[PDB]
Ligand binder design. Structure first.
Ligand code: ZN
Lengths: 373, 612, 371, 197, 190
C-alpha cells in the first residue's frame, strides 16, 4: 500500500532544508529494533529535531521509543494501528525525548561518556529546535479574538452547566465543574480552538477556566471563611452585584499579597543547612567495595525516593517496582565507605565535577518547600 | 441567572468606574489597573478613550493648573526676564506673576499668582502648561476676573470635557516569538505618539574654590551655560568646573585650555544632549570685596542676576508702596508673605548689619549658584513598560518598522503584538470585549466612509464633507445604521440619542475621525455574549475576520494561516520603577592596576592569556 | 466626539463632592471667616488656648493672635546668633503669627510661630520637597479596641506622710483639669457626662457591656469625624499641655514678669509645629505624581488610626460607601485605603449616611454575616 | 585629595614614556636626534630627587598633549621622561638659558602683551577708596618659578651640546643663574600663550 | 562591573549571547577602546579619553567599528567572557558579549530566551550584575558555571530539569502546526 518507508538514522543524516521539505503523507519509519512506527510528516519532523545528540555518534541504535507516536506499531492485524491516538506534543514532551536520546547514548557505550557532553548536546538541541521552529513556522501563529470565546461559550453542554445549578459546594464543584470537565477532555468537540488545544497541551490550566466558563464558587476572606452564598456568574459573563464583586475583591489581591510576603521569611531556613552541609565534600566515581550495607524498610511513599540506588540481590536502577513495597531491604548507602558513586547512587552522575554534594542537596531540599507555598 | 441586569453605579466604584467591563476582569488585575494609573506620565499623543464612561468627564475637572482663587481685580502684572530687542534680552520668558486684590471682601486681601511654563511633581517626569489664549491676552493692570477662572491648563484636558490618559493603538493578537514573558512588539510610528517629557534641574557652585569653564563659546565670548532657548551640546556637558591654581595659569588658564574639557581632574554635570533650556536662576553673594572669580568670566551671570534682582526689587517696592497706604490694615495671603521673604533673602543688605549666610539644606552657597532647568523628550526603544488599561502590563522587547508590521486585508496597520494566551491565565476578559467592540465600531466607521464618496484611513477635507452631507437620503441611512449598531452593545446610547436634534452633525462627526465614540456606563442593561453572538451572526456590523500578512524574523513576506482580528486597545506608558582571584582583583589596588596594565600594554585587549 | 453625546454623558453623570475632591486639608485648615480674616488653624489655636485657661493664674489672659508681616518674618528667620545670620534658601510654604499674651494688663513679648500653609489639592511643600496631607478616621467619642475601652483626650490618653499629697495632687489634676468643653461636643454619643466622676460611673455601668456583649461592628467606617488638624498640630497640643502642667504641677506661687517671659520663651519656640512634620507624621507622605490629575493619589488618600502612629480587616458594606473596594494597595488592601469622593460629608468632617444606596448596602451587610 | 579614578593614572604612567609622540603632538618640526640627545640622560637623573621648578616648567609646556595635574599622580619614571620631552621643546624653541635647568640635581614691555594673551586677571582689594588694577595671573606663576630657580645652586647632568648653546663656562660645573632668567621665562610663557591662542 | 535590566533575544541566536547597550559598553570597555584609539589612530590618551566620554550618549561609526573589532579579536570564543549574576548553580552563568546595541535609548542587557528559566525571568524590576573577565584564564576557570551545567536534573536520577522547557507562544505555534486536521484519516487515505 501507499506508505513510504524511511529509516531512523537516514532522516537524521538529512539536512535541515531537505528535512523540512519532506512530502505530506502517511509513511513508515524503520527503527533499529524490531518495530515500525506509522506517523505523519509534521510529527516526525519534530521527532528528528529531538535526536540532535544522536547525530554525533553514528553507531548508536535508535529504538522505537524515541518517536512521539510510539504507540502506533505496524503489527500483523490491521486494527491495532488503524485508529489509534498519538502522543500529545507538550512543553515537557520535547524534553523527555532529548533525555531518552542522551541516555540511549549513555547506555549504548557502557558507562563511559562524560555527561557534560550530553548536557551540552541537550541545550544545543533545544537551541537548534527553537531556531528551526521559529523561522520555519511563521504562518502557524495561534491567535485569540472575540470569535474564540463565542465557540467555547456557545457549546450546549457548557450552557446546560450554568442553568439549574444547586448553590452548594457539591452542586457546583462536582456537578457543574464536572459537566464541563468531561467535555473539555473530549478530543472531538473543539477542533482548532486556541483555548482548548492550549489546555490539552499544558499551557492553560482548567482551574482558571472553571471560574471563567462556569460558576465561581465560595471565595474566602483574610481568614479562610466561606460566605454561605456562592457567585452566580463567571468571568466571561461578568459579575455586577455588590455582594459577589465585594467577595471576589476580598479573594483577588489580599490572597496573593500574603502569598508574596510569606516567601522571604523562609529564606532563613535553608542558609544554615547550606553552610553546615559543606563539611561533606567532593564525589569521586568508582566503587569502594565495602561490605557495610544498611537495611531500610520500603514504603509506597518512599519508593520514589529510592529511584536511583544500588540493590543487592543474590550477590537494578529503577523506581517503578510495584512489588517489594513492604519488605525491608538491604542496600548500600553513604553511611559506609573506605563517598563513592555506587554508595551515593546514580543521582550523582547528574552532578558536575566541581560541585559540593551537600550544598546541592541543601538547595534541592530548600527549593521544594518554597515551590509549595 | 440575572445576566442582563446590573446594580452598581459610578458612586460605589472609586477609580474602577474609569473603565467598563470591570466585572469581567479579576480583582487581582482590577487592582493592578488602578495601581498602574497614577504611575503613567503624560505622553505627547493624548486623546480621549474610544469607550467612555461618566468618570472621564469628572476626572478632567480636578487637575493641577493655575486658577484664580476668588473674585479679584489685578493690581500689577510682573514678568521675570523681560523680552525685547536689545543686547541683554533673554527670549521666551518662563515666569509671569500677577498681583491681585480680592474684590467682594471686607478686608481686601492681596495675593500673587505664579504662571510658569511647566509643572512637575515627579522626578524626571512632568508636563507643560498650555495657556488659555482668550484670557491671557486680557491680563491688564486694571481688569476684573471671576472665581475659578483657569489660565494655563494642561494638555490632557480638552476643550470639550474629556481627559487624555492614553492613546488608542491597533492591537493584533499573535503568538510571535517577541511576546515571550510579557513582551511587546511595538510599531515605530506608534512609539512616536507615546513620547513623555522630562523636566530636570542641574545645579552649579563656583566660588572661592573653583571657576567655570568656557563651553558653548568661541574665542571672543565666554558663555559657561546655554541661554534660554539654546540647546545643550551634543555631549550633554553643562558648566564644567576647574579648580583654583595660580602656578598652572599658563597651562590651564589659557583660551585653548579653558575651551577644552578634560574629563578627569574636572567636575562636569551631564544631562540630555537634545534639550531646550527653560529657566535659569542665579544667586550671587555680592558682599565679598575681593572677587575670587577672575576678570571676564561673569559676563553671563550678571546678565541674568541683574534681571532677577530688578524683579525682586520691583516686588519689594510694590509691597512697601502698599504698606504706606493701608497702615495696619494689610491682610495678605500666605503665599504672598513667603514671596516677600524670598525677595528679602535675595536682595543684598545694607552694610549696617551682617550679611546673609545662605544655605540649601545644610549646603553652603559660595558666591554663585546657577540653577538651570531643561526639558527633554524621550523616545521609547527598549525596556519601556506599557499597559492596556487592564491588569496586563508588559515590557517592549522588539521595535519594527511601519512596513514590517501586521496588516489586514482592509489596510489597517497594527501598532502592537500581544500574546493572547495570558488572557485565560490572568483572567482579564474585558480586553476581549474592548478589542471586539472596537474592531466592530472601527470597521463600521470605515465601511460607512466607503459607501460615501471618500477614502478610508484618511481624514477628509471640509469640502468633501460639504458634498457628502448634501444628499439627505444617505445621512438618514447612515444614522439608522449607527443607531442599529448602538442598539446592540450600548442600549443607554440608543435611548439617549433617539432624541437627537440635527442628526447630520453626528454623521459628520463619525465620518471625520476613524471611530464612533461610545458611552459605556458601569451599569448598562446589556448582555455581553449575546451582543457578541449578535455581532457574529449578522450581515451588517460584523468586523473583518481574515488573514494577516507581516514580515517574520527573517526577510520574508508571510501570510498567516489563521483568521486574525485586529482591534484597538487604550494603551498607556508606565514609568520605570578561582573566586579568590576575582575577589583579589577588587580588594587589592595592585591587582587592579596590574589588570589595567595588562589591558593597556597588550597587543589585543581582549583574549589576554593571564593577568596578575 | 459628538458634542450632544458629551452633553448626554454630562447629564447622566453624578457629580463628585467638591469639598473632598479639591482637598479637605485646605478646607479644615486655611479657611477664612467672612467677618474676621482668620484662618481655621488660628481658630484652632484659640480653641486650644481657651480650654487651658482654667489652669492660668488670675491676671494672666491669652489675648488673641495676630498675623505677622513679611519684614518681621524675614528678620525672625535670619536672626544673628553667633555673629552669623543663617539663611535657608529653600522653597517652602510658611507663614508667621504672634501669640500675644498678657498678665494683669502688661502685654509681654510676642512669640512667633511657623505654620504649614497648605495648598489646593493637599499640596504642601516643606524644605524644597513636595508633600501630601491626608486625613485620618478619628472614632467619635470612645474608640473601642479588642482589649479594653480607650477614650482619647488632648492632654493624656489612657487605655483602661509625704506620699498622700502626691496622691491627692494627681486627682486634683484629674478632676477639674479634664472637664473640657470641646469634649462635651465629642461625648454626645449616648453619653451623659458633665462631671469627671460620672465618666467613671458610666464606664463601669453604661459602657460595661462593651467588653463581652458589645453593640459595635468594629469593621465599619460609619460615624467618623475625619480630622486633619488634631494630628497635624500634635506638638503644639503637647506644648500647650506642658505649659498648663508647668503652671499646675510645679507650683502655684508668686509669678513675676521675668518668670512668665522665661516660661513663654522656653515653651513656645519658633518651630513648635514644624520639627517633626516630615519625621513622625504618618499623614504626610512624599508626593510622587507623574500625572496632571490629583484624584488618583494626591487628594484621595486616607490614613487609618494605627497607620497614623508612625482581626479588624474583615469585609463590611461600609467599604462600598466610605472607602474604595477593588482599589487595593500593598499597605491598606482591605478597602480602607483611598477616599471615594462621592461620599456625603457634612460640617466638621462628620461622615453621614447616604439615602439612595442604603437599601443595597444594608442588604449586602445582612448577606455578609451568616453561619 | 581630588580622588582620580584608579586605572586612569596607569594610562598616564604609560603615555609619559611615549616621548616622541608627545613631542610631535605640539610641534612637528622637531629633530628626532635632539629628542634622542635629551633621552640619553634620563637614567643618570633617575637616581636624583626631582625639584618643583622642573615640575612647573614641565607642567607649563606640554599641556596641549598631557594633563598638567597628572604630574602629582604619576611615578618617577614618568616625570623623568616628561622632563626629557620638555627639554627638547625648550631647546628647539630657542630658550637655551632655561632649558639647562630641566635635567638638574641640587648642589615692562611684556605686560601689555601678557595681558592680551592672558586676559583673565585676579581681582584686587581696594585700599582707602581707589580701584586697584587687577594683577595678571601669569606673573605670579613666573615669579614662583623665578623664586625657585634662584633658591639654591645646581649641578648640570644633561646633553653637552646644550651646555655650549647657552654661554656657560665650566669651573666646577656648578650651575649659575643669568640675570635675564625672568625675562626669558616670561618670553617662554609668551611663546606658550601665542601657541595656544 | 555593570548593572542593567534585562530583555529577551527573540531571534535566531545562541544560548550564550549577551547584547550590551551602548552606554554600558562604552564605559566598560574604556581601556579597551583607548588601546585601539592609541594604536590605529595617532591619538594620545587624553584625546582618547575625551573621545570615549563624548560618545557615551551619542552614536558614531568609529566606536561601533572598534566594538565589532574588539568582539572579533576573540578567535576561539564567540566574544568576551562574562558572569551574569542574580542576587535572589542556575543563578550565575557564563555568557559571551557578541553585540553592542546601536540604539542609544535602549538601556538593557538582553539575555538568552532559553536561559530565562534557571533564573526567574523578571522583566519588570530586576537589575542583574555583570562582571567582565580580564583574561582567558578566568574565562576557562568559570566554565563550571555555564548554561549547560543546570540541564541535568538534581532531583531524579535520569531526567532533564524543567528549566529546558519552552515558553508559551513558542509551544503554541508548534501546537497550531503539528496538531492540525491537515491529512485525511488512515483508513480513508488508503
Ligand atoms: Zn562507599
Amino acid at each position: 500500500m501507499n506508505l513510504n518507508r524511511y529509516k531512523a538514522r537516514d532522516l537524521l543524516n538529512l539536512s535541515y532544508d531537505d528535512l523540512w521539505s519532506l512530502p505530506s503523507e502517511w509513511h513508515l519509519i524503520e527503527f533499529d529494533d524490531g518495530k515500525t512506527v506509522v506517523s505523519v510528516d509534521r510529527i516526525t519532523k519534530l521527532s528528528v529535531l529531538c535526536w540532535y545528540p544522536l547525530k554525533h555518534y553514528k553507531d548508536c541504535p535508535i529504538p522505537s521509543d524515541h518517536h512521539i507516536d510510539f504507540n502506533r506499531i505496524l503489527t500483523d492485524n490491521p486494527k491495532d494501528y488503524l485508529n489509534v491516538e498519538g502522543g500529545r506534543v507538550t512543553s515537557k514532551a520535547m524534553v523527555k525525548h532529548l533525555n531518552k536520546a542522551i541516555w540511549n547514548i549513555y547506555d549504548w557505550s557502557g558507562e563511559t561518556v562524560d555527561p557534560e557532553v550530553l548536557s551540552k548536546l541537550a541545550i544545543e538541541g533545544k537551541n537548534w529546535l527553537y531556531n528551526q521552529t521559529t523561522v520555519k513556522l511563521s504562518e502557524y501563529l495561534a491567535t485569540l479574538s472575540m470569535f474564540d470565546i463565542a465557540e467555547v461559550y456557545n457549546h450546549p453542554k457548557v450552557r446546560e452547566a450554568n442553568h439549574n445549578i444547586e448553590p452548594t459546594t457539591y452542586g457546583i464543584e462536582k456537578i457543574s465543574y464536572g459537566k464541563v470537565k468531561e467535555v473539555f477532555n473530549d478530543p472531538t468537540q473543539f477542533i482548532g480552538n486556541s483555548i482548548i488545544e492550549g489546555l490539552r497541551s499544558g499551557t492553560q490550566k482548567t482551574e482558571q477556566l472553571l471560574q471563567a466558563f462556569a460558576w465561581r464558587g465560595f471565595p474566602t476572606d483574610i481568614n479562610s471563611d466561606i460566605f454561605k452564598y456562592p457567585v452566580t456568574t463567571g468571568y466571561i459573563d461578568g459579575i455586577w452585584n455588590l455582594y459577589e464583586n465585594m467577595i471576589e475583591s476580598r479573594s483577588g489581591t489580599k490572597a496573593l499579597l500574603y502569598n508574596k510576603e510569606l516567601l522571604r521569611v523562609t529564606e532563613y531556613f535553608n542558609r544554615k543547612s547550606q553552610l553546615i552541609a559543606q563539611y561533606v565534600q567532593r564525589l569521586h566515581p568508582g566503587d569502594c567495595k565495602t561490605t557495610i550495607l544498611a537495611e531500610y524498610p520500603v514504603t509506597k511513599l518512599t519508593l520514589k525516593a529510592f529511584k536511583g540506588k544500588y540493590y543487592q540481590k543474590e550477590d537494578w536502577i529503577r523506581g517503578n517496582e510495584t512489588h517489594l513495597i513492604g519488605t525491608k531491604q538491604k542496600f548500600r548507602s553513604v553511611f559506609g565507605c573506605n563517598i563513592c558513586m555506587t554508595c551515593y547512587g546514580r543521582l550523582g552522575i547528574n552532578i558536575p565535577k566541581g560541585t559540593n554534594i551537600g550544598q546541592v542537596a541543601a538547595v534541592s531540599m530548600g527549593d521544594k518547600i518554597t515551590s509549595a507555598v | 441567572s440575572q445576566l442582563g441586569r446590573r446594580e452598581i453605579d459610578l458612586t460605589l466604584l472609586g477609580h474602577t468606574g474609569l473603565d467598563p467591563w470591570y466585572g469581567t476582569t479579576s480583582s487581582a488585575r482590577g487592582a493592578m489597573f488602578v495601581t498602574h494609573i497614577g504611575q503613567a506620565p503624560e505622553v505627547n499623543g493624548n486623546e480621549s478613550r474610544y469607550f467612555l464612561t461618566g468618570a472621564e468627564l469628572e476626572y478632567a475637572k480636578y487637575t493641577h493648573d493655575v486658577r484664580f482663587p476668588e473674585d479679584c481685580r489685578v493690581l500689577h502684572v510682573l514678568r521675570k526676564y523681560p523680552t525685547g530687542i536689545g543686547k541683554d534680552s533673554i527670549r521666551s520668558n518662563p515666569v509671569t506673576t500677577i498681583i491681585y486684590e480680592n474684590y467682594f471682601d471686607k478686608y481686601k486681601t492681596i495675593g500673587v499668582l505664579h504662571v510658569p511654563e511647566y509643572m512637575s511633581h515627579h522626578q524626571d517626569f512632568g508636563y507643560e502648561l498650555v495657556k488659555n489664549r482668550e484670557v491671557w491676552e486680557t491680563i491688564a493692570p486694571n481688569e476684573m476676573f471671576s472665581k475659578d477662572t483657569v489660565i494655563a491648563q494642561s494638555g490632557a484636558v480638552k476643550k470639550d470635557g474629556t481627559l487624555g490618559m492614553g492613546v488608542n493603538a491597533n492591537v493584533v493578537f499573535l503568538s510571535a516569538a517577541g511576546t515571550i514573558e510579557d513582551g511587546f512588539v511595538a510599531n515605530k510610528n506608534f512609539l512616536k505618539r507615546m513620547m513623555p517629557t522630562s523636566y530636570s534641574t542641574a545645579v552649579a557652585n563656583a566660588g572661592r574654590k573653583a571657576f567655570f569653564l568656557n563651553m558653548y563659546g568661541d574665542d571672543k565670548i565666554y558663555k559657561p551655560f546655554p541661554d534660554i532657548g539654546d540647546v545643550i551640546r551634543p555631549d550633554g556637558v553643562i558648566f564644567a568646573i576647574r579648580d583654583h591654581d595660580d602656578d598652572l595659569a599658563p597651562a590651564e588658564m589659557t583660551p585653548r585650555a579653558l575651551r577644552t574639557l578634560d574629563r578627569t581632574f574636572d567636575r562636569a554635570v551631564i544631562g540630555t544632549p537634545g534639550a531646550k533650556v527653560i529657566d535659569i536662576d542665579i544667586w550671587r553673594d555680592e558682599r565679598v570685596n575681593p572677587s575670587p572669580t577672575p576678570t571676564g568670566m561673569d559676563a553671563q551671570l550678571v546678565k541674568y542676576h541683574t534681571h532677577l534682582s530688578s524683579y525682586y526689587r520691583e516686588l519689594l517696592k510694590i509691597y512697601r508702596g502698599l504698606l504706606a497706604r493701608r497702615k495696619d490694615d494689610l491682610h495678605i495671603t500666605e503665599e504672598f508673605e513667603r514671596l516677600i521673604v524670598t525677595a528679602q533673602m535675595f536682595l543684598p543688605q545694607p552694610d549696617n548689619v551682617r550679611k546673609l549666610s545662605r544655605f540649601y539644606r545644610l549646603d553652603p552657597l559660595d558666591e554663585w549658584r546657577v540653577e538651570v532647568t531643561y526639558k527633554a523628550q524621550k523616545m521609547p526603544a527598549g525596556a519601556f513598560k506599557m499597559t492596556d488599561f487592564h491588569g496586563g502590563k508588559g515590557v517592549i522587547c522588539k521595535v519594527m518598522e511601519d512596513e514590517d508590521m501586521p496588516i489586514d486585508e482592509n489596510g489597517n496597520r497594527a501598532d502592537l503584538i500581544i500574546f493572547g494566551g495570558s488572557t485565560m491565565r490572568r483572567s482579564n476578559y474585558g480586553r476581549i470585549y474592548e478589542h471586539g467592540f472596537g474592531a466592530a465600531a472601527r470597521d463600521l466607521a470605515q465601511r460607512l466612509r466607503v459607501e460615501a464618496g471618500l477614502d478610508r484611513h484618511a481624514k477628509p477635507t471640509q469640502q468633501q464633507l460639504n458634498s457628502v452631507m448634501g444628499n439627505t437620503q444617505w445621512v438618514d441611512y447612515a444614522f439608522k445604521e449607527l443607531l442599529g449598531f448602538y442598539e446592540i452593545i450600548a442600549p443607554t446610547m440608543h435611548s439617549k440619542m433617539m432624541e437627537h436634534p440635527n442628526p447630520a452633525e453626528h454623521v459628520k462627526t463619525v465620518l471625520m475621525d476613524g471611530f464612533p465614540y461610545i458611552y459605556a456606563p458601569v451599569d448598562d442593561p446589556v448582555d455581553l455574549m449575546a451582543a457578541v453572538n449578535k455581532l457574529i451572526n449578522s450581515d451588517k456590523y460584523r468586523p473583518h475576520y481574515g488573514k494577516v500578512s507581516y514580515r517574520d524574523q527573517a526577510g520574508k513576506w508571510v501570510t498567516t494561516k489563521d483568521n486574525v482580528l485586529m482591534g484597538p486597545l487604550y494603551m498607556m506608558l508606565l514609568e520605570k520603577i578561582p573566586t579568590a582571584e576575582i575577589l583579589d582583583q577588587t580588594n587589592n589596588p595592585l591587582a587592579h592596576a596590574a589588570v589595567i596594565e595588562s589591558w593597556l600594554t597588550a597587543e589585543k585587549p581582549s583574549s589576554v592569556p593571564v593577568a596578575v | 466626539p459628538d458634542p450632544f453625546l458629551i452633553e448626554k454623558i454630562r447629564e447622566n453623570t453624578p457629580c463628585m463632592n467638591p469639598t473632598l475632591a479639591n482637598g479637605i486639608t485646605v478646607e479644615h485648615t486655611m479657611t477664612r471667616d467672612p467677618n474676621t480674616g482668620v484662618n481655621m488653624t488660628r481658630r484652632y489655636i484659640d480653641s486650644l488656648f481657651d480650654i487651658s485657661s482654667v489652669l492660668f493664674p488670675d491676671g494672666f489672659k491669652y489675648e488673641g493672635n495676630r498675623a505677622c508681616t513679611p519684614l518681621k518674618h524675614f528678620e525672625e528667620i535670619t536672626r544673628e546668633y553667633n555673629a552669623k545670620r543663617i539663611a535657608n534658601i529653600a522653597p517652602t510654604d510658611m507663614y508667621m503669627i504672634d501669640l500675644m499674651f498678657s498678665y494683669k494688663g502688661e502685654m509681654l513679648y510676642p512669640r512667633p510661630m511657623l505654620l504649614p500653609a497648605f495648598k489646593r489639592g493637599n499640596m504642601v511643600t516643606i524644605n524644597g520637597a513636595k508633600y501630601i496631607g491626608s486625613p485620618v478616621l478619628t472614632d467619635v467619642g470612645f474608640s473601642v479596641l479588642n482589649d479594653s475601652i480607650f477614650i482619647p483626650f488632648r492632654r493624656t490618653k489612657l487605655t483602661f506622710g509625704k506620699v498622700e499629697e502626691n496622691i491627692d495632687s494627681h486627682l486634683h489634676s484629674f478632676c477639674n483639669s479634664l472637664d473640657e468643653m470641646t469634649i462635651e461636643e465629642l461625648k454626645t454619643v449616648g453619653v451623659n457626662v458633665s462631671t469627671i466622676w460620672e465618666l467613671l460611673y458610666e464606664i463601669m455601668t453604661s459602657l460595661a457591656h462593651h467588653l463581652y456583649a458589645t453593640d459595635i461592628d468594629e469593621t465599619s467606617m460609619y460615624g467618623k469625624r475625619l480630622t486633619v488638624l488634631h494630628y497635624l498640630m500634635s506638638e503644639f497640643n503637647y506644648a500647650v499641655s506642658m505649659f498648663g502642667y508647668m503652671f499646675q504641677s510645679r507650683r502655684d506661687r508668686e509669678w513675676t514678669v521675668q518668670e512668665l517671659n522665661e516660661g513663654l520663651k522656653r515653651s513656645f519656640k519658633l518651630q513648635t509645629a514644624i520639627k517633626r512634620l516630615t519625621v513622625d507624621h504618618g499623614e504626610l507622605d512624599t508626593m510622587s505624581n507623574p500625572n496632571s490629575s490629583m484624584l488618583i493619589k494626591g487628594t484621595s488618600i486616607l490614613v487609618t488610626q494605627d497607620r497614623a502612629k508612625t482581626s479588624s480587616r474583615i469585609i463590611h458594606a461600609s467599604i462600598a460607601e466610605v472607602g474604595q473596594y477593588k482599589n487595593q494597595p500593598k499597605n491598606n488592601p482591605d478597602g480602607r485605603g483611598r477616599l471615594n469622593m462621592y461620599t456625603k460629608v457634612g460640617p466638621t468632617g462628620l461622615v453621614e449616611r447616604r439615602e439612595e444606596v442604603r437599601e443595597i448596602i444594608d442588604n449586602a451587610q445582612l448577606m455578609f454575616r451568616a453561619k | 585629595k581630588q580622588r582620580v579614578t584608579p586605572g586612569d593614572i596607569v594610562a598616564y604612567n604609560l603615555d609619559a614614556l611615549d616621548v616622541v609622540k608627545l613631542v610631535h603632538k605640539i610641534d612637528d618640526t622637531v629633530p628626532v636626534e635632539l629628542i634622542q640627545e635629551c633621552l640619553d640622560c634620563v637614567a643618570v637623573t633617575a637616581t636624583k630627587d626631582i625639584y618643583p621648578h622642573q615640575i612647573l616648567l614641565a607642567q607649563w609646556v606640554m599641556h596641549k598633549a598631557f594633563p598638567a595635574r597628572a604630574f602629582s599622580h604619576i611615578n618617577k619614571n614618568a616625570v623623568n621622561h616628561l622632563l626629557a620631552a620638555a627639554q627638547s621643546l625648550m631647546w628647539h624653541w630657542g630658550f637655551q638659558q632655561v632649558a639647562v635647568f630641566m635635567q638638574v640635581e641640587l648642589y615692562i614691555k611684556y605686560k601689555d602683551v601678557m595681558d592680551e594673551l592672558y586676559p583673565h586677571q585676579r581681582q584686587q582689594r581696594a585700599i582707602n577708596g581707589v580701584p586697584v588694577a587687577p594683577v595678571n595671573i601669569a606673573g605670579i606663576a613666573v615669579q614662583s618659578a623665578h623664586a625657585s630657580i634662584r633658591s639654591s645652586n645646581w649641578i648640570y647632568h644633561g646633553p653637552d651640546r646644550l651646555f655650549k648653546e647657552a654661554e656657560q663656562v665650566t669651573q666646577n660645573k656648578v650651575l649659575v643663574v643669568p640675570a635675564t632668567i625672568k625675562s626669558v621665562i616670561t618670553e617662554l610663557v609668551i611663546h606658550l600663550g601665542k601657541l595656544n591662542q | 562591573t555593570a548593572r542593567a535590566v534585562i530583555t529577551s533575544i527573540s531571534d535566531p541566536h545562541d544560548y550564550d549571547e549577551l547584547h550590551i547597550p551602548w552606554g554600558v559598553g562604552c564605559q566598560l570597555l574604556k581601556y579597551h577602546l583607548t588601546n585601539k584609539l592609541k594604536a590605529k589612530f595617532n591619538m594620545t590618551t587624553r584625546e582618547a579619553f575625551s573621545f570615549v566620554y563624548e560618545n557615551v550618549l551619542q552614536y558614531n561609526q568609529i566606536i561601533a567599528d572598534l566594538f565589532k573589532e574588539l568582539i572579533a579579536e576573540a578567535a576561539p570564543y564567540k566574544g568576551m567572557g562574562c558572569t551574569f549574576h542574580r542576587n535572589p548553580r542556575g543563578s550565575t552563568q557564563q555568557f559571551f558579549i557578541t553585540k553592542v546595541k546601536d540604539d542609544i535609548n535602549d538601556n538593557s542587557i538582553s539575555m538568552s530566551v532559553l536561559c530565562l528559566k534557571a533564573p526567574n525571568a523578571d522583566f519588570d524590576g530586576d537589575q542583574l550584575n555583570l562582571t567582565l573577565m580580564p583574561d582567558v584564564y578566568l574565562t576557562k576557570a568559570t566554565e563550571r558555571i555555564a548554561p549547560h551545567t543546570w540541564v541535568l536534573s538534581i532531583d531524579e536520577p535520569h531526567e532533564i530539569s524543567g528549566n529546558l522547557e519552552l515558553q508559551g507562544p513558542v509551544v503554541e505555534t508548534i501546537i497550531n502546526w503539528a496538531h492540525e486536521k491537515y491529512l485525511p484519516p488512515l483508513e480513508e487515505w488508503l
